[PDB]
Amino acid sequence: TKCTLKSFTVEKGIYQTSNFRVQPTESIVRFPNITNLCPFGEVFNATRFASVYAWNRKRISNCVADYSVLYNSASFSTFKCYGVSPTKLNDLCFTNVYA
Amino acid sequence: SALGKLQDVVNQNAQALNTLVKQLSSNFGAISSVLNDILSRLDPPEAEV
Amino acid sequence: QCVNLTTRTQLPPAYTNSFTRGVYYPDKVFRSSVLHSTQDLFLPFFSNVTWFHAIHKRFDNPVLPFNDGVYFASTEKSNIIRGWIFGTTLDSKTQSLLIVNNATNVVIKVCEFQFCNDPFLGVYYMESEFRVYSSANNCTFEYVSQPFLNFKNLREFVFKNIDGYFKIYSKHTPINLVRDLPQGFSALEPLVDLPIGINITRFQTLLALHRSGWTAGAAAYYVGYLQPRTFLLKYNENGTITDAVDCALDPLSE
Amino acid sequence: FQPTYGVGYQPYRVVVLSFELLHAPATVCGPKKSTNLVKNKCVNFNFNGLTGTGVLTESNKKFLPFQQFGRDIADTTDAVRDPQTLEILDITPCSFGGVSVITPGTNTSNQVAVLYQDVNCTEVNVFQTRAGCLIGAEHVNNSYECDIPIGAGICASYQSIIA
Numbered sequence A: 001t002k003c004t005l006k007s008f009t010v011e012k013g014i015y016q017t018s019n020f021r022v023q024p025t026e027s028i029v030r031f032p033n034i035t036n037l038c039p040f041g042e043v044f045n046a047t048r049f050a051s052v053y054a055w056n057r058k059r060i061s062n063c064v065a066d067y068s069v070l071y072n073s074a075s076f077s078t079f080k081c082y083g084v085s086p087t088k089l090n091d092l093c094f095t096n097v098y099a
Numbered sequence B: 001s002a003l004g005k006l007q008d009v010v011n012q013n014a015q016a017l018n019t020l021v022k023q024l025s026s027n028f029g030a031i032s033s034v035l036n037d038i039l040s041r042l043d044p045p046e047a048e049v
Numbered sequence C: 001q002c003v004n005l006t007t008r009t010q011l012p013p014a015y016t017n018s019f020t021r022g023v024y025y026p027d028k029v030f031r032s033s034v035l036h037s038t039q040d041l042f043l044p045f046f047s048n049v050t051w052f053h054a055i056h057k058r059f060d061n062p063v064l065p066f067n068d069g070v071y072f073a074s075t076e077k078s079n080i081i082r083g084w085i086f087g088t089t090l091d092s093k094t095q096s097l098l099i100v101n102n103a104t105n106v107v108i109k110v111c112e113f114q115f116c117n118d119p120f121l122g123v124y125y126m127e128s129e130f131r132v133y134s135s136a137n138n139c140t141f142e143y144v145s146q147p148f149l150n151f152k153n154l155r156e157f158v159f160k161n162i163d164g165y166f167k168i169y170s171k172h173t174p175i176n177l178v179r180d181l182p183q184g185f186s187a188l189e190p191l192v193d194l195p196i197g198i199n200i201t202r203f204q205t206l207l208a209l210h211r212s213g214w215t216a217g218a219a220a221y222y223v224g225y226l227q228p229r230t231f232l233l234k235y236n237e238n239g240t241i242t243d244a245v246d247c248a249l250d251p252l253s254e
Numbered sequence D: 001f002q003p004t005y006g007v008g009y010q011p012y013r014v015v016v017l018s019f020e021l022l023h024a025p026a027t028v029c030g031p032k033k034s035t036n037l038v039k040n041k042c043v044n045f046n047f048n049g050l051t052g053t054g055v056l057t058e059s060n061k062k063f064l065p066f067q068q069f070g071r072d073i074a075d076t077t078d079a080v081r082d083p084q085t086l087e088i089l090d091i092t093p094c095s096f097g098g099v100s101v102i103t104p105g106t107n108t109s110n111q112v113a114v115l116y117q118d119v120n121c122t123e124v125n126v127f128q129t130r131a132g133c134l135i136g137a138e139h140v141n142n143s144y145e146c147d148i149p150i151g152a153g154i155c156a157s158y159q160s161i162i163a
C-alpha cells in the first residue's frame, strides 16, 4: 500500500493494491477417439508384393496414420525420410499419401 | 413503463458492458482477434506488430 | 448404358413460395434462450422456389446451375429420389461428385464419370436398373455412410460448397399436405461435412423408374438458391431454433 | 531370389510413402494425444482446437447431438462437449479479483487486513463476506457505525481490526 500510494504514511481506509489472478494448474487436451485408421497393414503385411517394373501404387486419404509404430518396429532394415521427421509426420497434416 | 427511468440506466450500463466485451472479438486489422493464435502462428518480430 | 426417355410431356417448370423454409443451423455452437444474428448463405423468406414434378406423363430431370448453394425440398413418398450429381461439365474432362442411396447403402464418390444425358434408377414391379454413368476412371474419394432417407415425407436438404467443404444439412418432417409446401418452421440440422475440394457449378438429381415401358412414381421436388444475407435466429431453452427473421425482407423485420 | 543368397542379393520389400499438400482440404494427419480429463480445477483446456483456461465442471445443459460448443450472449465459450465421453462441461473462468488493503493510519497502527474481492475463502482470522474474502479481521456480532467501508453492509474498524 505504501508503494502504491507513493507515501510512507497511509491514511485510514481501504486501498486497492493488486490483483489475485489464479494461475492454471495443469493442461488438459481432449480429442476424439482414434478411429478409421489407415490401412498400413494392407500395404506392409501383404502376402505377395509387386515387382518393381509394375510397382503397386495405393492412394491413402481420409484416415489417421501412426508413423510412430512404423518407426518403432525394429524389423525395418532401412527407414530414410528426406523431407520430414517422424515427429513431423505425427504433426503435419497431408492431403494425399501414395504408397 | 412506470419505472422506465431506472430501466434505461440499467439497460445503458448492460449495453455498454456488452459492447465492451464484443470489442474483444474484433481483430482491428490484425490477422486474428485471438492472441494465442498469433503467438502460435507467427514469429515474434511480426507478432509484436 | 444410357437410355433416352422420349415419352415426356412438354411443360414449363412451376414456381411457388418458400414461406419460412430453408433455415439451417449456421454452426456447431449451442445457444440457449438468446437471439443471434448471422451473415451466411441463406434462402430468402417468401422467395420464388422452382417446382418440378414426377407424375403420370411428367418426368422432371433437368440439369440446374449450383450457384452459391442449393436448397432442395422433397415432398416424397415411396422413395423415388435417390441421389444427386454435382460438378462443372459432368464428364471425364472434369471431376464430379456422386451421391446415391440405392436399396442397401449410401455411397458418396468423387470420380471422373462419363455421365449419361438421362441418368436414372429403376425399380421393377425389386430394383434392377442402374443407368448413371458409363465409366469411372480417376476416383479420388469414396465415402460409405448410413441411410439418409398423398405425400407423407418432407425431406429438406441444403448443399453448400465453401472452401472445399461440401456441407449437407438435412431435415425429415412428417407431413400430410397434398400438393404444395407446408407453411411452418423447421430448422435443418447439419448432416455431413464432406472434404471433397472440387469445383461445383451444376447439379442434377436422380429419379427412379417403375417398370411393369416405364412409369414415374408420384413425387415432387423444389429447387431454391442461397444468397449471402443476415438472419436473426431465436434459440429457446432447449437450444433448438424455433423462429428466424430475414433482415432484408421488409422494414418491419429490418 | 534363393534363400542361400548373400546380403545384397537377398529380396528386400520396399514401400515408399509420398506425402503431398494440394489446393484441397487435408485429411491424413497423425493421432492427437488425449490426456485424462480433470474437473473442479483451473486448467488450460484444449478441446478439438478450442484452447483456453478455465475450471471445467459438470453441466446441466442438454446439447443437441450435432452441437459441440456453447456460447453466452457476449460470444464467450462457456460450455463444451467432451469428445472422448459424450458429456457436457461448463467452463467457469478462473478465479480473479482485486486485492485491497484495509488499514488504519500508520500513526495509529501497522496492522492490516486483506480483502480478496469476489474470491471464495477456500481457494485463496478468515471471514467470508459478500464483498469477498477478508483475512486478518475478527468478525464480531455487534453493530457499530461504519469506520472503513468494506461493502455489502460490511465495515471495518480498529479497536485489532474488527469487521
Ligand SMILES: *[C@@H]1O[C@H](CO)[C@@H](O[C@@H]2O[C@H](CO)[C@@H](O)[C@H](O)[C@H]2NC(C)=O)[C@H](O)[C@H]1NC(C)=O
Pocket: C002, C003, C004, C117, C118
Ligand atoms: C440421349 O440424348 C442425348 C441428346 O440428344 C444424346 O447426346 C448426344 O450424343 C451424340 C452421340 O454421338 C452426340 O453426338 C451429341 O452431341 C449428344 N448431344 C448432347 C446434347 O449431348 C445421348 O447420346 C442420347 N443417348 C443415347 C443412348 O443415344
Ligand SMILES: *[C@@H]1O[C@H](CO)[C@@H](O)[C@H](O)[C@H]1NC(C)=O
Pocket: A040, A041, A044, A045
Ligand atoms: C505386420 O505383422 C507384424 C508381425 O507381427 C505385426 O507386428 C504388425 O502389427 C503388422 N502390421 C504392420 C502394419 O506392420
Ligand SMILES: *[C@@H]1O[C@H](CO)[C@@H](O)[C@H](O)[C@H]1NC(C)=O
Pocket: C015, C048
Ligand atoms: C417466379 O418466377 C416466374 C418466372 O421465373 C414468374 O412468372 C413468377 O411470377 C415468379 N413468382 C414470384 C412470386 O415472383
Ligand SMILES: *[C@@H]1O[C@H](CO)[C@@H](O)[C@H](O)[C@H]1NC(C)=O
Pocket: C088, C089, C199, C200, C201
Ligand atoms: C469453376 O467452374 C467455373 C465454370 O465451370 C469456372 O468459371 C471457374 O473458373 C472454376 N473455378 C475454379 C477455381 O476452377
Ligand SMILES: *[C@@H]1O[C@H](CO)[C@@H](O)[C@H](O)[C@H]1NC(C)=O
Pocket: C102, C103, C104, C105, C107
Ligand atoms: C448399391 O450400390 C453399391 C455401390 O455401387 C453396391 O455395392 C450395392 O450392391 C448396390 N446395391 C444394390 C441392391 O445393387
Ligand SMILES: *[C@@H]1O[C@H](CO)[C@@H](O)[C@H](O)[C@H]1NC(C)=O
Pocket: C137, C138
Ligand atoms: C485421369 O484418367 C486418364 C484416363 O484414364 C489418365 O490418362 C490421366 O492420367 C488421369 N489423371 C489423373 C490425375 O489421375
Ligand SMILES: *[C@@H]1O[C@H](CO)[C@@H](O)[C@H](O)[C@H]1NC(C)=O
Pocket: C236, C237, C238
Ligand atoms: C424443452 O424441452 C422440455 C423437455 O425437457 C419440454 O418440456 C419443452 O416443451 C421444450 N421447449 C419447447 C419450447 O418446446
Ligand SMILES: *[C@@H]1O[C@H](CO)[C@@H](O)[C@H](O)[C@H]1NC(C)=O
Pocket: A033, D083, D084, D085, D086
Ligand atoms: C470413444 O471411447 C470411449 C471410451 O470410454 C467410449 O465411451 C465412446 O463410446 C467412444 N466413442 C465415441 C464416439 O466417443
